[PDB]
Design a protein around this ligand. Structure first.
Ligand code: ADP
Ligand code: ADP
Ligand code: ADP
Ligand code: BEF
Ligand code: BEF
Ligand code: BEF
Ligand code: MG
Ligand code: MG
Ligand code: MG
Ligand code: ZN
Ligand code: ZN
Ligand code: ZN
Ligand code: ZN
Lengths: 362, 334, 333, 365, 364
DNA sequence: CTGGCCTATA
DNA sequence: TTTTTATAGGCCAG
C-alpha cells in the first residue's frame, strides 16, 4: 500500500495542518459562530495546503458528530472523505472538465438533496481552467444556492477568474510556508517514518522548497532515493547542487576586476564540477547584496562570513554603490532570462560577459 | 531509440527503488536531447510491465513482454504529439487520464510515458495535474524535459526529479571516435555544441547537418569582413533554423571569449572563423548580435506559426544596422 | 469556337444556338446574366426539361452514367447544365466530358459554368472537338482600367446617359462588385426617367461597397497611391479578411523589393526582373516602387511588418488592422 | 447566514445609489410611460439583478402598477421568495442556445396566470449565442401588451447594436466609498455586530466600488475577527499594515537617511510583514502624494491620522523626483520574483533609491 | 412606447430615405415592380417600416399606388397586424429548413384578399445555408401573385446567388437635423415640453438611428418627470458615455488636470477595465498621428467621434504626439505592477502631466 | 447523434 | 498567386 510522503502525510484533521493559521482561524470561527458561507475560494502557490484544507472543511461540514471545526476522522463520513469514497463530496477536476456542457450537468444535479451526508459539497479544484462560458454558468447558482449546498473552489491562480465570480465568494489567500515552518514539519515526518537525518540537510531542503510543502516533501523523497536510505547533509547538497562558499565570491571578484579571462575560466572549472547554474547566480546575488548593505553600515556583514569577511569589506570600500546596483540588476535579469537561453551554461556566460564589460565609467 | 552505456548506473539506481516497490509514481527525468532518456524510460517501463521479471531484467517470454515487444500492450500509454504537429494537446491527455480508471486491461500495472513535458500545452499540463498528484494504484508516470524550469509550476511539484548528467567530455570524445571518424577537434566541437551530450553530438555527423554547419561557416566567413549579413539568409532559412541560429550564436560567443582571452571555446574546430569575428567586430556589437540571435531563436521556437523567413530577414537587416557607428544597441529587460 | 463577351452574347444566341454553351469566368453577375440569357432563349425554342448538376470530384462514376443516359431521343427539348470545381476539369472529369462531346442533339443543349481554365485544360481533346459547335463566354470582371468603358456601355444599353464624372463616381464605389454597380443603374433609372445621370444626382444615390483582394492593396502600395490603399484596407476589413493573409502577401512583395533594391546596384533592372520571374504586367509597377523607396525605407518596412506579425501571433493584439494602416502610409513617400 | 444575500433590498427605499435609475423608473410607473424592454448594465454587485426584481415586483403589485410595491400581497411576498408564477427568471448563462430562446418565445403569446404582466427577466444576458440574440429581435421590438423584458448584464457591448437600439439602457454606476461605508454600517448595526469605525472605511475602500464585494468582505471580516469587525482584523485580512509604519519608511527614504530606512525594515521584519505587500503600500503612498500635488482636495478621506505629514511631503518634494521614487519602487516590484530572497529584494530596491537618490546620493569612493 | 407608436403608416410620414421612396413610388406608379426587393442599412433607419409601406401600396383597395391611403380595410388591416396576405416571417426564429420548406409550400396558392401575396422576411441574414437554397428556388421562378420583401442589417451574409435576384435598396443613416426635426415633431404632437438644445443633444447621441433616438427620448422623458430639459438630458447622456478615452486625450493635451482626474473618476463609475482605457488611448493617438499623414486616414467608421479628431490632429505637434504615445505605452507595461490598476492609469496620466512639454506641472 | 461548418478568444 | 494555432461554443440537416 505504498505512497509518496507528499501524499501519505496529507493533514487529516485541522490540527495536523502547518501554518495558514489565519485561514484555519476564520474557518473554525465561522463553523462555530454559525456564520457558514456557501462559496469558499482558496488560493495560493503550489502545495501550501489549498486543496488539503478544502477537503478538511468538507469533513467538518459533514461529520457524523455535528457540524464541527475539529472533525473526528472516525465516522463513516470522515474516513469515507479521507479515501475519496464519500458520496456527498463531489470533487471536480476543473482543469479536465472545463466545458460548459459539463458544468451545466453539475448544476442540473445541485437541486437534488444529499445522499448520506448533511451538505452536498462541490469541490471544484484547479478552477481557473473552466471555460469562460463555464464560469458564467455558475454565476446565478454560486450567488444563490440551495440551502443544502456548499461550493469550495481552489486555484493557484485566481487572477484568471471573472471578477463576477470573485464578488460572490469568500476568498482565503494562503500564505507560502515559512522556511522554519517547513523544516519543523520535515523533521516531524522523518521522525515518524523512522528515517535518519542531519539537521543542516533539512535546512537546505526548506530553502530549496521555495515556500512549498509539497515541493519540499517531493525533494525529501528524492533525497531518500539518491541517498540510499539516509537523508544526509552530504547527499542533499550533492543532489541540490549546493555551493562551497569560495567559488561564488571568486567570480564576483573577477567580475568587477573586469577580468574576463578569469571569469570565463572560473565558470569552466565550475561546469566541470557540475554546479547548478541558477544556484551560482543566486549566491552571486546574495554577495552583491551583502556588499551593497555594508557600504551602508559597517555592522551589517554577518557573524556567518568570518572566512570571507576580509574580501568582502574590500569589495565594499572599492566599488561604488551605483556600480554594484548595476551589477545586481544585470545578474537578476540574467537569472530571470536563464531558462530561455540555448544551454543553461551559455546563459550564465552571456550574463557574465554582459556585466563584465562594465568596469570603466569615464 | 538506442541505449548508451552511461545509463547503467542511473538505471540500476532508479530500478532499485521500484524493485522494492517504493518507487515514486511520477518521475520527471531531466536530460539533454540525445542523452538517451527515452531508453532509460523504456527500460524502466518494460520492467514494470513484465510479469515474470528476472531481477532488473524483462524476460521476453511472458504475455506482457510479448505485447510490449509488438507495440500493443493495453496498459502502456505513449503521450507524444500528433504526427503533423509539435505541441501535445489537451484532448490527448484526457483519453489517457480516463482510460487510466479502467482496471488494467491486462491485470497489471499501467505506465504513461510523456515524451516531452515541454510540449504539453498550457491546458494539457493542467489536465494532467490532478491525475498526476494521485493516480489510481500501480500507475506509473514518466515525463522528460530539457529544462524543468520552463514547466508548469504546479506540475513540477508533483514529480520527483532525476538528473541524467552527461559523461565527462573525455569519455564522450572517446565514445564518439568509435562511431564516426572525424578530426579530434571536430568531435570536441560537435560535443560542445550539443551541451555535452554524446550522440546528440553524434547526431550532427549523421545528418545533412554537419555539411550545413560548414555552409553556415562558409557564408559567415564572407559576411563578417564585407558586412553583408543579409547574405546569411540562405544558410539560416531552413526549418532547422533554431538549431543553426544556435550554431551562429555560439560562434559569436567564442569571439567574445577571445576578446577576454578565455581558454575554452565551443567551436574548437573553426578557430579561424572565430578569430575573424574577434577582428572585425567590437565587443559591443559582438554582444548585441549575440543578444538578438538568441532572442529570435526563442521566438522561432516558441511562437506558434510565426514566419521564419520574415523573422530571420528582419534580424539580418537589423544586424547590419547595429554594425554602423553610433547606433543604439539592445539591452536585456526587466 | 466563337469566343464572346457577355454583352455580345445576346446577339450570337439569336443568330444560331450551338450544341455547347461554355460560361467560364469569375464574376458572379456575368455568370448569372449569361446563364439566364441562354435558359430564356432555350425555353423559347421548345425546351421544357431543365436539368442542373453540380460537378465535384464527388460525382461518382454512377452520377456521370445518369448524365450520358440523360440524353435519348425523342423527348421534348431538354437543357442540361453542369457546374464546376475550383480546379476545373481534373483527370477524372477530363474523361467524363469526352463522353458527352459526341451525344449532341438540337434536342440536348449543354450549359457549363465555372472559372477560367489552365491552358492544357482547354487544349484537352474533348474541348477542341467541341470547338466549332460551342460558344464560350468570358465572365472575368473588369479591372480598375477596363471598367469605366463597361459602365458607359451598359449605361447606353439601358439607354441612360452617363457623365464622364458620374462614370468615375460609380467605378469608385463599386469596383469589383459588378452586381451592385448593375443595380446602381437599375436604381437610378427608377429614380430618374429622364435617363440623364448628372454627377450631383448620382452622388446622392450611391453607397460605398467595393470588393478587393489583398492583391489590390499591394498593387496600390507598390505604385504609391495611398488614398487608394486606405480605402482598400477599410473595405478588406468589413469583408472580414484574415489579416494574416494580408501580412503574408504584402511580404512576398516587400521581401522581393528588399532583395531587388540590393542587387540593383550591381546588375541592370531588366536582368533582375528576369532572374526572378516577375510576371510581365507587374514589372512596370515594381520599378516605380524600387525608384521611390530607399534601401532604408524598405528596411523599416520589414521591421514594422515583423512587429505587427509578433503582435498578432504572440501578444494576441487588436492593433493589427491599424498597424497596417500605418505600414501602408510608410510605403508611400 | 449570508449577508450578501440577506440584505437584497426589498423596496426602492432600500437601494443604495442609482438615483438616476430609480428616479426614472419611479417617474415612469406613475407617469404610465412604461417601456417594454429595460436593459440594466454596470459592474458586479451594484444592484442590477435586484433592481430588476424590484421593478418586476412593482409592475405586478395587487394594489396597482406602482413604484412602491407593498411587500405583503400574495404577488409581492411570492416574488420575494422567488416563487411567483409570472416572474420568469431566466439564467441566460444556461439557456444560452437558440433552441432555448425559441422555447421562451413560443410561450410569450400565452397570458399570465396570476399577474398583470408576464415578466421575463433575462439575467447574464451577454452570454446568449449570436443566434439567439437575433431570435429575440422582433419579439423584443413589438411584444404583446401583457409582456415585459428585463435584461441585465455586466457588459452591454457584447450585445448586438440591433438589441441595444430596442430598449431603455440604465447604466448603474459603481458606488462611492462613502455610500458603501454608510450601508456597511447600517447593516452591521441592524445585524447587531460590534465594529470599529475605521475598519469600515478600510472595507468600503477595498470593495473597489462593488456593494457585494463589500458585503462578501465583511462576511469574512466577521469570521476573521470573531463576531467583531475590528481594525486589527480587517487590515490583517487585507494585507494592509496600520498606516504609520509604511509612510515612515517613505519619509525616511526621501530624507536620504540610510540607518532609519534599514532599521525601519529590520522592524518590518520582526513583524513578518509580507515583502511585496510593503512595496505596495509605498507606491500607494507615493501616488496619493503626487496626486495631492496636482489637485489639493484629492487626498483621501481614509488617511486623516496621517494627513499632516502627507500634505507636507507633497509641498516639499519636486514632482520629477516623486515619479523617480515610484519608478524605482515599481521595477523593484517587477524584480522581486527573481531576486534571491524576497526581503533582500526589497532592501536592495531601497538601496537603489539611496544610490540614485536625487538630493543626497550615497557616498562615492 | 414612442418607438412603436410613431412608425410611419404613410410614405409622407417617413424621414429622409428619399432615394428609396422615390424609386419605389415611381416603380409602383409606372408599373415596374420587381419580383423581389431587399432592404438594408443600420438598426432603426426604416428598413422594416418601408417594407410594410410597400406592402400597403402594393395591395391597396384604391390600387397599386405610391400614396397608399392608410384607411381602407386592407390598409388598417396591415397597420394593425392581421392582413391575410401579408405573411411577415421573423426569419431569426424560423431559420431551420423544415420551416422554410413549409413557408413556401403555400407560395403557390393564390392570395385570398388583395392583388398580391407579400412575403416579408425580416432579419433574413439568419437563415441556414439550406433555407437559402430553398428560398432561392422560389425567387428563380417567382409566381406572379407573389412579391418578396427581404430586410436585414447585414446583407453581406446572403449568398451572392440571392442578392443577384433582389433589387437591393440601401437605407442611409439619418442625419442630425433629419432626426432632430422628427424629434421635435413627435414630442410636440404628444404634447411634451422640450428645450431646443436638449433635442439637438439627443439627435447627436442617437448616432444616426431614429430608433436609438426615440428610445433615448422615452428614457429622457422619464428622468425629467414629463419634461425633456437640457438640465436632464445632459445628465442622462453622461450616464451613458462611451466617451472617456477620447475625452482624456483632449483633456491631457490641454493640460487640464482637474478635468483629467475627473474623467478618470467618470470612468470608474462606468466600471471600466483599466488596461482597456489605456489601450483605447494609445489607439486614438495612433489614429490621429496618421490623419497627420493624410486626411483619408479617418474612417467611414469614425463619424460620430470624427469631428473632434481632425481638430485634435490640426492643433497638435507631431513630435509631441510620439511623446505622449511613449508615456502611455510605458504606463501599460508598468500597469500590472502599479498598486491599483486605477492608481496605475492615474500615475501614468500624472506622469504625462508633469512632463507635459506645452504647459508643465508646478514645482515647489 | 453525427460530421460539416461557422465563430470567438487568447 | 490568397492563411497562425489550441481550445472552446455553437447551428444545422437528416
Ligand atoms: N499547510 C500544510 N500542512 C501540512 N502539509 C501540507 C500543507 N500544505 C501542503 N502540505 C503537503 O502537501 C501535499 C499536497 O497539499 P495540497 O493541499 O494538495 O496543496 P494544494 O494547495 O497546492 O492543492 C499534502 O499532501 C501535504 O503533505
Ligand atoms: N444598490 C444597492 N443597494 C443595496 N444593496 C446592494 C446594491 N447593489 C448591490 N447590493 C448588494 O449586493 C447583493 C447582490 O446584488 P445584485 O443586485 O445581484 O448585483 P448585480 O447587479 O451584480 O446582479 C444584494 O443582495 C445587496 O446586498
Ligand atoms: N425613416 C424613418 N421615419 C420615421 N420613423 C423611423 C424611420 N426609421 C426608423 N424609424 C423609427 O424606428 C422605429 C423602428 O423602425 P424600423 O423601420 O423597424 O427599423 P429597422 O430598419 O431596424 O427594421 C419605427 O417605429 C420608427 O419610429
Ligand atoms: F498544487 Be496546488 F493545488 F496548487
Ligand atoms: F453580480 Be452581478 F449580476 F454582476
Ligand atoms: F429592425 Be432593425 F433592423 F433594427
Ligand atoms: Mg490541489
Ligand atoms: Mg446578478
Ligand atoms: Mg427590422
Ligand atoms: Zn467525524
Ligand atoms: Zn516479461
Ligand atoms: Zn404587493
Ligand atoms: Zn388603402
Amino acid at each position: 500500500s505504498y505512497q509518496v510522503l507528499a501524499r501519505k502525510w496529507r493533514p487529516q484533521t485541522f490540527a495536523d495542518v502547518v501554518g495558514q493559521e489565519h485561514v484555519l482561524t476564520a474557518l473554525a470561527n465561522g463553523l462555530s459562530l454559525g456564520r457558514i458561507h456557501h462559496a469558499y475560494l482558496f488560493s495560493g502557490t503550489r502545495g501550501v495546503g489549498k486543496t488539503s484544507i478544502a477537503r478538511l472543511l468538507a469533513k467538518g461540514l459533514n461529520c457524523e458528530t455535528g457540524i464541527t471545526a475539529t472533525p473526528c476522522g472516525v465516522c463513516d463520513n470522515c474516513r469515507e472523505i479521507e479515501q475519496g469514497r464519500f458520496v456527498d463530496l463531489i470533487e471536480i477536476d476543473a482543469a479536465s472538465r472545463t466545458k460548459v456542457e459539463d458544468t451545466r450537468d453539475l448544476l442540473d444535479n445541485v437541486q437534488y438533496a444529499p445522499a448520506r451526508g448533511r451538505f452536498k459539497v462541490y469541490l471544484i479544484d484547479e478552477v481557473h481552467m473552466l471555460s469562460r462560458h463555464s464560469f458564467n454558468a455558475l454565476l446565478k447558482t454560486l450567488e444563490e444556492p440551495p440551502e443544502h449546498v456548499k461550493f469550495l473552489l481552489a486555484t493557484t491562480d485566481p487572477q484568471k477568474l471573472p471578477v463576477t465570480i470573485l464578488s460572490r465568494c469568500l476568498q482565503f489567500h494562503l500564505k507560502a510556508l515559512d522556511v522554519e515552518q517547513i523544516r519543523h514539519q520535515l523533521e516531524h515526518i522523518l521522525n515518524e517514518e523512522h528515517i535518519a537525518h542531519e539537521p543542516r540537510a533539512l535546512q537546505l531542503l526548506a530553502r530549496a522548497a521555495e515556500g512549498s510543502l509539497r515541493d519540499a516533501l517531493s525533494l525529501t523523497d528524492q533525497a531518500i532515493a539518491s541517498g540510499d536510505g539516509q537523508v544526509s547533509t552530504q547527499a542533499v547538497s550533492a543532489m541540490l547542487g549546493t555551493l562551497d562558499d569560495d567559488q561564488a565570491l571568486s567570480l564576483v571578484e573577477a567580475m568587477v576586476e573586469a577580468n574576463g579571462e578569469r571569469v570565463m575560466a572560473l565558470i569552466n572549472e565550475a561546469a566541470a564540477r557540475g554546479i547548478e547554474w541558477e544556484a551560482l547566480l543566486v549566491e552571486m546575488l546574495g554577495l552583491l547584496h551583502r556588499i551593497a548593505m555594508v557600504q551602508l553600515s559597517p555592522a551589517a556583514l554577518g557573524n556567518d562570513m568570518a572566512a570571507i569577511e576580509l574580501r568582502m569589506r574590500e569589495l565594499a570600500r572599492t566599488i561604488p554603490p551605483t556600480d554594484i546596483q548595476l551589477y545586481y540588476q544585470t545578474l537578476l535579469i540574467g537569472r530571470k532570462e536563464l531558462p530561455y537561453a540555448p544551454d543553461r551554461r551559455m546563459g550564465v556566460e552571456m550574463t557574465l560577459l554582459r556585466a563584465l564589460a562594465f568596469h570603466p565609467r569615464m | 531509440m538506442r541505449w548508451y552505456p552511461w545509463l547503467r548506473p542511473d538505471f540500476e539506481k532508479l530500478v532499485a527503488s521500484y524493485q522494492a516497490g517504493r518507487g515514486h509514481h511520477a518521475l520527471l527525468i531531466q536530460a539533454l536531447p540525445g542523452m538517451g532518456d527515452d531508453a532509460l524510460i523504456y527500460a524502466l517501463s518494460r520492467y514494470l510491465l513484465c510479469q515474470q521479471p528476472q531481477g532488473h531484467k524483462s524476460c521476453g517470454h511472458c504475455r506482457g513482454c510479448q505485447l510490449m515487444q509488438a507495440g500493443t500492450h493495453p496498459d502502456y500509454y505513449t503521450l507524444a504529439p500528433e504526427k503533423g504537429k509539435n505541441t501535445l494537446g489537451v484532448d490527448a491527455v484526457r483519453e489517457v487520464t480516463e482510460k487510466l480508471n479502467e482496471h488494467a486491461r491486462l491485470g497489471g500495472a499501467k505506465v504513461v510515458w510523456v515524451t516531452d513535458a515541454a510540449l504539453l500545452t498550457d491546458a494539457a499540463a493542467n489536465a494532467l495535474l490532478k491525475t498526476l498528484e494521485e493516480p489510481p494504484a500501480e500507475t506509473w508516470f514518466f515525463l522528460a524535459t530539457r529544462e524543468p524550469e520552463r514547466l508548469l509550476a504546479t506540475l513540477r511539484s508533483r514529480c520527483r526529479l532525476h538528473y541524467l548528467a552527461p559523461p565527462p567530455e573525455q569519455y564522450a570524445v572517446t565514445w564518439l571516435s568509435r562511431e564516426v571518424t572525424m578530426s579530434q577537434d571536430a568531435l570536441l566541437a560537435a560535443l560542445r555544441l550539443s551541451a555535452g551530450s554524446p550522440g546528440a553530438a553524434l547526431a550532427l555527423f549523421q545528418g545533412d547537418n554537419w555539411q550545413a554547419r560548414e555552409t553556415l561557416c562558409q557564408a559567415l566567413a564572407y559576411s563578417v569582413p564585407s558586412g553583408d549579413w543579409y547574405s546569411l539568409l540562405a544558410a539560416l532559412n531552413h526549418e532547422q533554423a533554431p538549431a543553426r541560429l544556435h550554431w551562429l550564436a555560439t560562434l559569436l560567443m567564442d569571439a567574445l571569449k577571445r576578446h577576454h582571452g578565455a581558454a575554452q571555446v565551443t567551436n574548437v574546430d573553426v578557430p579561424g572563423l572565430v578569430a575573424e569575428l574577434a577582428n572585425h567586430l567590437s565587443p559591443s556589437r559582438l554582444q548585441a548580435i549575440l543578444g538578438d540571435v538568441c532572442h529570435i531563436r526563442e521566438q522561432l521556437m516558441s511562437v506558434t506559426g510565426i514566419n521564419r523567413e520574415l523573422l530571420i530577414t528582419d534580424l539580418l537587416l537589423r544586424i547590419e544596422h547595429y554594425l554602423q557607428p553610433g547606433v543604439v544597441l539592445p539591452v536585456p529587460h526587466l | 469556337m466563337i469566343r464572346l463577351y457577355p454583352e455580345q452574347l445576346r446577339a450570337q444566341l439569336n443568330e444560331g444556338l450551338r450544341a455547347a454553351y461554355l460560361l467560364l469566368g469569375n464574376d458572379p453577375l456575368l455568370l448569372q446574366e449569361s446563364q439566364d440569357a441562354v435558359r430564356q432563349v432555350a425555353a423559347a425554342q421548345g425546351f421544357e426539361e431543365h436539368h442542373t448538376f453540380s460537378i465535384d470530384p464527388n460525382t461518382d462514376w454512377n452520377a456521370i452514367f445518369s448524365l450520358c443516359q440523360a440524353m435519348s431521343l425523342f423527348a421534348s427539348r431538354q437543357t442540361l447544365l453542369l457546374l464546376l470545381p475550383e480546379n476545373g476539369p481534373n483527370a477524372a472529369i477530363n474523361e467524363q466530358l469526352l463522353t458527352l462531346t459526341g451525344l449532341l442533339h438540337d434536342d440536348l443543349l449543354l450549359i457549363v459554368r465555372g472559372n477560367k481554365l489552365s491552358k492544357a485544360q482547354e487544349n484537352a481533346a474533348w474541348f477542341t472537338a467541341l470547338a466549332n459547335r460551342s460558344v464560350q463566354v468570358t465572365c472575368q470582371t473588369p479591372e480598375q482600367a477596363q471598367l469605366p468603358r463597361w459602365v458607359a456601355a451598359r449605361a447606353k444599353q439601358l439607354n441612360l446617359e452617363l457623365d464622364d464624372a458620374a462614370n468615375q463616381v460609380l467605378c469608385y464605389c463599386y469596383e469589383g462588385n459588378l452586381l451592385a454597380l448593375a443595380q446602381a443603374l437599375e436604381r437610378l433609372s427608377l429614380l430618374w426617367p429622364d435617363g440623364k445621370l448628372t454627377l450631383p444626382r448620382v452622388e446622392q444615390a450611391v453607397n460605398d461597397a467595393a470588393h478587393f483582394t489583398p492583391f489590390h492593396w499591394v498593387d496600390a502600395l507598390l505604385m504609391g497611391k495611398s488614398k487608394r490603399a486606405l480605402h482598400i484596407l477599410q473595405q478588406l476589413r468589413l469583408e472580414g479578411s484574415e489579416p494574416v493573409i494580408l501580412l503574408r502577401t504584402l511580404q512576398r512583395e516587400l521581401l522581393l523589393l528588399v532583395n531587388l533594391k540590393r542587387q540593383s546596384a550591381h546588375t541592370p533592372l531588366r536582368a533582375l526582373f528576369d532572374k526572378h520571374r516577375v510576371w510581365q504586367n507587374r514589372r512596370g509597377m515594381m520599378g516605380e516602387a524600387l525608384n521611390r523607396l530607399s534601401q532604408t525605407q524598405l528596411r523599416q518596412a520589414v521591421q514594422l511588418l515583423t512587429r505587427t506579425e509578433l503582435t498578432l501571433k504572440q501578444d494576441y493584439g487588436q492593433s493589427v488592422w491599424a498597424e497596417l494602416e500605418g505600414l501602408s502610409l510608410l510605403l508611400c513617400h
